[PDB]
Amino acid sequence: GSMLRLSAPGQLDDDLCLLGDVQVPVFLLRLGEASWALVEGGISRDAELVWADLCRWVADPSQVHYWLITHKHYDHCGLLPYLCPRLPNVQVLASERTCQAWKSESAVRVVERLNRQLLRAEQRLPEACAWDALPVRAVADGEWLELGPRHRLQVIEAHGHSDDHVVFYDVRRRRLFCGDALGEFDEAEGVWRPLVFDDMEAYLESLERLQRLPTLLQLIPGHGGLLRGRLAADGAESAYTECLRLCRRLLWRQSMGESLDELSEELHRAWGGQSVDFLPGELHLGSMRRMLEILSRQA
Amino acid sequence: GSMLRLSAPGQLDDDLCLLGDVQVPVFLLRLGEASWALVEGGISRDAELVWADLCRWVADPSQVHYWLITHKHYDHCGLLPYLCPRLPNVQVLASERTCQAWKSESAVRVVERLNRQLLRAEQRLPEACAWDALPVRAVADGEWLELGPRHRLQVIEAHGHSDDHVVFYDVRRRRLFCGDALGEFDEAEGVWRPLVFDDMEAYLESLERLQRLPTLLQLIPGHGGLLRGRLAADGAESAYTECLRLCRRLLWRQSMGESLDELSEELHRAWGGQSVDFLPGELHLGSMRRMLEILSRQA
Numbered sequence: 118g119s120m121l122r123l124s125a126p127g128q129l130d131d132d133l134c135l136l137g138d139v140q141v142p143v144f145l146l147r148l149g150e151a152s153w154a155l156v157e158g159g160i161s162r163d164a165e166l167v168w169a170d171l172c173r174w175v176a177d178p179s180q181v182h183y184w185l186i187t188h189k190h191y192d193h194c195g196l197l198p199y200l201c202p203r204l205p206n207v208q209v210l211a212s213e214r215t216c217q218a219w220k221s222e223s224a225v226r227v228v229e230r231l232n233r234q235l236l237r238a239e240q241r242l243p244e245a246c247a248w249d250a251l252p253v254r255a256v257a258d259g260e261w262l263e264l265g266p267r268h269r270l271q272v273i274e275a276h277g278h279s280d281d282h283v284v285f286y287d288v289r290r291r292r293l294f295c296g297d298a299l300g301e302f303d304e305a306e307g308v309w310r311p312l313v314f315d316d317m318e319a320y321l322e323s324l325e326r327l328q329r330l331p332t333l334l335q336l337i338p339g340h341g342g343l344l345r346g347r348l349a350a351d352g353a354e355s356a357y358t359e360c361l362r363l364c365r366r367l368l369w370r371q372s373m374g375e376s377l378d379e380l381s382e383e384l385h386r387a388w389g390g391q392s393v394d395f396l397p398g399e400l401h402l403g404s405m406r407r408m409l410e411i412l413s414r415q416a
Numbered sequence: 417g418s419m420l421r422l423s424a425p426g427q428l429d430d431d432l433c434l435l436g437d438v439q440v441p442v443f444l445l446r447l448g449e450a451s452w453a454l455v456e457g458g459i460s461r462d463a464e465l466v467w468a469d470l471c472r473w474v475a476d477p478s479q480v481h482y483w484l485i486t487h488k489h490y491d492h493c494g495l496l497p498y499l500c501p502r503l504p505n506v507q508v509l510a511s512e513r514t515c516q517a518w519k520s521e522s523a524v525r526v527v528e529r530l531n532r533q534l535l536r537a538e539q540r541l542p543e544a545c546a547w548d549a550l551p552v553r554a555v556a557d558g559e560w561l562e563l564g565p566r567h568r569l570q571v572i573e574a575h576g577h578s579d580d581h582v583v584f585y586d587v588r589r590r591r592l593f594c595g596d597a598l599g600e601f602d603e604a605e606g607v608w609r610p611l612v613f614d615d616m617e618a619y620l621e622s623l624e625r626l627q628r629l630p631t632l633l634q635l636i637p638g639h640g641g642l643l644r645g646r647l648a649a650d651g652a653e654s655a656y657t658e659c660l661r662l663c664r665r666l667l668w669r670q671s672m673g674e675s676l677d678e679l680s681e682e683l684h685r686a687w688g689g690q691s692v693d694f695l696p697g698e699l700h701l702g703s704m705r706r707m708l709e710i711l712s713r714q715a
């Protein structure tokens with residue numbers, strides 16, 4: 118029947134396609150006859166899949182002009198060293214803090230190691246360019262990106278999930294590329310699972326600000342596809358509520374004397390399955406523990 | 417450590433005691449030197465336990481003057497035929513709709529059958545008086561009950577859980593006896609599980625009205641004890657949110673083609689354990705299915 122989520126590779130709207138894996142998608146925006154943008158930077162191992170899809174839509178790779186990046190996590194920038202060399206005219210648009218992480222050998226080693234863990238036996242990665250050789254340009258909170266005549270996207274700072282996270286708001290289409298700032302959309306239940314890995318105060322304040330946008334028609338997180346209808350319209354509000362709900366559960370359990378590890382293991386059991394293809398199980402469990410440490414400290 | 421729930425038989429406050437089983441408690445209010453009230457009507461099988469506790473606090477059973485009843489469900493009035501004969505001066509205070517159910521042989525047979533299922537092998541029920549012989553007086557929405565010099569309780573209609581449900585608000589102590597109108601308090605997670613068995617529109621409207629009470633200090637549902645602190649202060653708001661959350665889950669699952677039975681069985685698995693001592697498992701599962709039918713119809 119009719120559903121409030123579009124989650125299949127191919128055309129999502131007359132200007133928008135989903136490339137690659139719906140679990141870690143790259144979005145393609147048609148900005149004009151011979152101009153395109155990518156949104157979200159994916160995982161390295163998807164390089165040839167995303168390339169194959171891209172070339173179905175884009176006749177000449179020199180026509181890809183922008184690549185918008187929400188945050189520095191390994192699953193949101195892993196394609197950059199592999200596909201940017203094939204995109205001679207692309208400019209990577211990322212926050213200043215995101216750009217800074219790509220200059221840190223420590224940070225990029227973590228990104229590389231996690232991406233390497235996801236390589237399947239059959240596939241061959243193309244040659245990687247250096248992370249500090251990427252064609253990057255820093256974007257600022259509030260900045261207007263005039264990508265094409267019918268694509269004006271505002272950069273909105275949305276820290277909390279991570280210290281660098283931004284979202285991109287298409288004012289014309291009432292479409293928000295929200296990365297991981299709302300959490301992980303639960304494919305079985307239709308609710309947001311919080312992903313607070315840096316700062317709960319910031320995460321909630323970001324959601325407060327995003328709630329004040331004009332009512333959304335389309336909401337596109339970092340994983341799982343495109344949400345529409347009420348799922349888009351109430352996404353930020355719902356994500357805020359789910360974060361407060363997790364805080365309530367944690368506080369109640371702590372009042373009974375539970376260690377953080379009990380709820381962490383429960384969340385890992387309940388939620389880890391959705392991301393097994395792109396997130397090692399032990400890192401998922403560790404992430405749940407970190408989130409609960411943050412909520413406990415700040416709630 | 418300090419917890420926001422009191423859940424042990426005995427004194428809860430200087431005017432208030434919990435009698436019987438914390439799972440299906442009867443509350444004792446000291447209205448004066450020689451005047452007392454009971455709140456909530458429990459399950460029949462607890463008659464001698466509640467009697468034993470009552471007589472620890474009350475020197476003379478003729479001093480019990482009122483018995484406040486939230487609703488007609490079998491687990492909220494089962495003690496009445498067994499203990500009212502031992503309470504010569506008691507007046508049972510119930511809504512008109514609640515009183516009407518006790519006049520219906522069909523309705524009381526259901527109450528009797530469910531209560532009989534809960535009798536343990538060891539115990540002996542005292543002789544029951546007829547349901548239409550109970551010393552009942554109907555109370556109205558908005559009615560002020562002047563129970564004693566320091567106990568003024570307002571009757572507030574709170575339909576939705578059932579067609580007859582009311583709650584009792586102690587204006588002085590900012591204490592709400594809320595029956596099942598907020599749902600079932602989850603002992604492991606500290607959130608409300610919705611219990612919508614008649615009408616979702618009414619259930620939500622009741623919670624909207626209860627949210628507008630002065631901030632609560634104490635919130636006393638039909639099961640599980642007394643809540644305080646933020647759990648009391650945000651109870652009605654939280655219960656409203658949890659009902660909307662369940663609607664979201666159901667609607668999402670229905671959009672995927674699920675039958676009501678799938679979520680019903682999941683809820684029965686997740687939630688049925690808490691009430692096994694006083695609610696037959698098949699009735700819990702049936703109740704979950706009924707709730708989901710109502711939410712589907714009205715959401």
Ligand SMILES: C[As](C)(=O)[O-]
Binds near residue numbers: 312339340396404
């Ligand atoms: C790697 As993640 C849980 O921030 O999408």
Ligand SMILES: C[As](C)(=O)[O-]
Binds near residue numbers: 491
């Ligand atoms: C018997 As019931 C689930 O309304 O407390």
Ligand SMILES: [Fe+2]
Binds near residue numbers: 188297
């Ligand atoms: Fe992330």
Ligand SMILES: [Fe+2]
Binds near residue numbers: 190193297340
């Ligand atoms: Fe992510």
Ligand SMILES: [Fe+2]
Binds near residue numbers: 487489577578
């Ligand atoms: Fe009930």
Ligand SMILES: [Fe+2]
Binds near residue numbers: 638
């Ligand atoms: Fe009940």
